[PDB]
């Protein structure tokens, strides 16, 4: 047993090749419409693979009109997670991602102006495996 975890402080995100360091939350899932069909002879139900659909959520603190200006244009997100206790890093890129809705306006009271972005991506590439 040893400490080799990773923290979000090590996260580095390149939105269209530009460091959007102000984003403090990101999650992306690559889900599949797995068809589950039941066969006559088998007690247990058979699950068959389907096509894959990429979705991603990205929210942070506003510092400019980057996303509102961007619109629904296709772009790329390169996510890099680097291990600091030991050398090594994971590096993912979402091959072709688009927004589902522009966070045009959002604000409340004296709270910091937070921004939330949600969208979909067609595919991905795994560049580093740790």
């Amino acid at each position: 047993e040893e400490a080799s975890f990773l923290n979000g402080s090590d996260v580095v995100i390149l939105i269209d090749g530009v460091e959007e360091l102000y984003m403090e939350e990101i999650k992306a899932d690559f889900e599949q419409d797995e068809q589950s069909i039941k066969l006559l002879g088998c007690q247990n139900e058979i699950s068959r693979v389907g096509t894959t659909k990429g979705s991603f959520s990205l929210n942070g603190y506003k510092t400019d009109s980057k996303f509102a200006k961007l619109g629904f244009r296709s772009f790329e997100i390169i996510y890099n997670l680097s291990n600091s206790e030991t050398l090594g890093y994971e590096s993912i890129r979402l091959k072709n991602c688009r927004l589902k809705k522009l966070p045009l306006i959002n604000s409340k009271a004296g709270e910091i102006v937070k921004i939330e972005v949600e969208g979909s991506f067609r595919g991905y590439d795994l560049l580093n495996e740790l």
């Binding site: 039941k38 066969l39 006559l40 002879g41 088998c42 007690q43 139900e45």
Partner: protein, 197 residues
């Protein structure tokens, strides 16, 4: 308390449905009429004197006789020309019917069981002052008869073939002529006799 009994006669079987008819039983009645429209008066309804062939349909499942044998039995009965007697206790139906359509189904689970979907038709016989001939004639006897002590060939003919004067039909069969003596009047106990048809 609801049960369904199918009392076949040509095959001396009395099938009792193991399981009740699922969601609901239903029976329709529709009077025989057809519109006639007269000039400058409009439509009128004229009753037709006959009665209609109405159906009773439901669906059951046969749980783990085996369901395979029951399905085979009902499929065999589907081709039967003679009628089946359907009795439904709580519903209150009782009368001769015949199966129009029958179907069985195996499901992904519960493979031992067989889901059933059966339909029936009301049956009526064609007979082709005195008492009316309203009685159905659904009684069956074995095609081979064992002669009893008190029997006479006329008595056998009446009991087993109807009119009673039908005895020469029994006698003229060569097997009957062989087992029976050349005198039709004299007959013995125990010997087998074959009614015709």
């Amino acid at each position: 308390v609801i049960d369904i009994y199918l009392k076949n006669e040509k095959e001396k079987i009395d099938f009792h449905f193991p399981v009740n008819p699922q969601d609901s039983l239903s029976i329709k009645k529709e009077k025989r009429f057809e519109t006639v429209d007269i000039v400058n008066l409009g439509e009128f309804d004229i009753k037709k004197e006959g009665e209609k062939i109405r159906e009773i349909s439901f669906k059951t499942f046969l749980p783990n006789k085996n369901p395979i044998e029951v399905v085979a039995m009902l499929e065999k009965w589907v081709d039967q020309a003679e009628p089946l007697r359907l009795i439904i206790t709580g519903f209150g139906y009782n009368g001769l019917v015949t199966i129009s359509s029958f179907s069985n189904t195996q499901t992904a689970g519960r493979e031992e069981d067989r889901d059933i979907e059966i339909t029936f038709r009301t049956y009526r016989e064609l007979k082709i002052t005195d008492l009316k001939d309203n009685r159905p004639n659904t009684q069956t006897k074995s095609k081979i008869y064992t002669v009893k002590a008190s029997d006479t060939l006329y008595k056998i003919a009446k009991n087993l073939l109807g009119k009673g004067s039908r005895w020469p039909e029994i006698y003229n069969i060569p097997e009957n002529k062989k087992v029976i003596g050349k005198n039709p009047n004299i007959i013995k106990k125990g010997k087998l006799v074959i009614p015709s048809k």
